[PDB]
């Protein structure tokens, strides 16, 4: 809790859905947004901060709260858009040999600035005396170790808590999340949403020799007609769907009501039947 990681993760597809099956987490209360909508929002960089606290201290990790650990080791303002992912770790971090390794900085002068790591080891000086290093009646060790033991109960067990602080500065977003992919359909007028390029058409097989850097493709007069598959390299062709004009030939509503229908721009195989120019 006094020296916590600050992993700045960026330039990846953060699939938060995988975290629901890695370890049996016991707390996944995301205060900022919903985990379903989190996978559809881009971000610049995520700050991963992990630590280990007791069971009765997990409730102290909140966007604004006082306590022996909430304002002395790690404080969260009222803008945390991440999660409070935490889980019990009483399977490998509890042996009967003396757990004089951790600490929680019981002594302090005042509340620390939120999102700050103070790595200090000086002797706590309680005023009215210059302590150049002494341990008696005026200046003591401001650090105290825990008493984690395997043969204990719930509430005082080692709980690993990891937070993922999010930020959106004036920088291009790198991490966005997972990307769903559908199956390919060829020779059928359907919709497509290829890498932002949205539309409808008949994805057919083309013989165009695209350059190794080109992705999209247009026509003589401002119309997308071919794109590159985001999957394995293949050159497609986007022709518009089956459309045309309809005209009605009618001898007039005075002798009969039989009418003829002329579809313009069709080979009688895309709608007696006759095919004319």
């Amino acid at each position, epitope marked *: 809790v006094y020296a916590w990681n600050r992993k700045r993760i960026s330039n990846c597809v953060a699939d938060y859905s995988v975290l629901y099956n890695l370890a049996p987490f016991f707390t996944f209360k995301c205060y900022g947004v919903s985990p379903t909508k989190l996978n559809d929002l881009c971000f610049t960089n995520v700050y991963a901060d992990s630590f280990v606290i007791r069971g009765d201290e997990v409730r102290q990790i909140a966007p604004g709260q006082t306590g022996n650990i909430a304002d002395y080791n790690y404080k969260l303002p009222d803008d945390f858009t991440g999660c409070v992912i935490a889980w019990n770790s009483n399977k490998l971090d509890s042996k009967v040999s003396g757990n004089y390794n951790y600490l929680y900085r019981l002594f302090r002068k005042s509340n620390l600035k939120p999102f700050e790591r103070d790595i200090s080891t000086e002797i706590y000086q309680a005023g*009215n005396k210059p302590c150049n290093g002494v341990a008696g009646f005026n200046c003591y060790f401001p650090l105290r170790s825990y008493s984690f033991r395997p*043969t204990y109960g719930v509430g005082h067990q080692p709980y690993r808590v990891v937070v993922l602080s999010f930020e959106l500065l004036h920088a291009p977003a790198t991490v966005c999340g997972p990307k769903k992919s559908t199956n390919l359909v060829k020779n059928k007028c359907v919709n497509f949403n290829f890498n932002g390029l949205k539309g409808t058409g008949v994805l057919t097989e083309s013989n165009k020799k695209f350059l190794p850097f080109q992705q999209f493709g247009r026509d003589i007069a401002d119309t997308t007609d071919a794109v590159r598959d985001p999957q394995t390299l293949e050159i497609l062709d986007i022709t518009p769907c089956s459309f045309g004009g309809v005209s009605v030939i009618t001898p007039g509503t005075n002798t009969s009501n039989q009418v003829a229908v002329l579809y313009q721009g069709v080979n009688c195989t895309e709608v007696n039947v006759f095919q004319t120019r």
Partner: single-chain antibody
Amino acid sequence: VLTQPPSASGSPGQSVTISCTGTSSDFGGYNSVSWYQQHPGKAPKLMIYEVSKRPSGVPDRFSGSKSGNTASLTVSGLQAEDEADYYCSSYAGSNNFDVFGTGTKVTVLGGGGGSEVQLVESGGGLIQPGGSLRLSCAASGFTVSSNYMSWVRQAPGKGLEWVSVIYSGGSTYYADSVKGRFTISRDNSENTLYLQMNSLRAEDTAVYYCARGEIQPYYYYGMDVWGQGTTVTVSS
């Protein structure tokens, strides 16, 4: 709520071995059970804080091992003339007051801190019901603005209980008895640190004690120094 024997007078100093049951757990986390010797008149004095390593004092009271689910403080062979009350502290859970125990009469016979830092109070004689009375414990020695102090009240017959806990500079937690009607306000950071009554509800007639150190999360703090209390004597 803890379990303590009402009285203990048979076999003085041979098989007394008082304790405090009613825990039904492993003392939570840090196993630190303190023992306070409340004496009529002057303020109580610390006797032992951990299961071993007794502080500077009487050496005939040690071996406070935790047997089963209770710390059995070995008191046999101490003396045969004492009139006080032994109180034990446990239940160190997060934000849980009333850690003291009931009145245990450990009088083996029945019939037969002063200049350390400072000891001052307000002297609330004939307190009018309501209003706002301020009580201070100005200490010219240890800093009254950096250490973790507490306020504990006790009434005739009833035992002690946590009434006010204040951290360094970023916590103003109140007890469950007041539930909000008590507001702690710190005085100047270099003069003293006083309290506030804030329209008591006729239950604050108990006498107060401003301790320089915590009770349940007690630290060594060099030495445990207390101060004498004053009678409220409300006229509601």
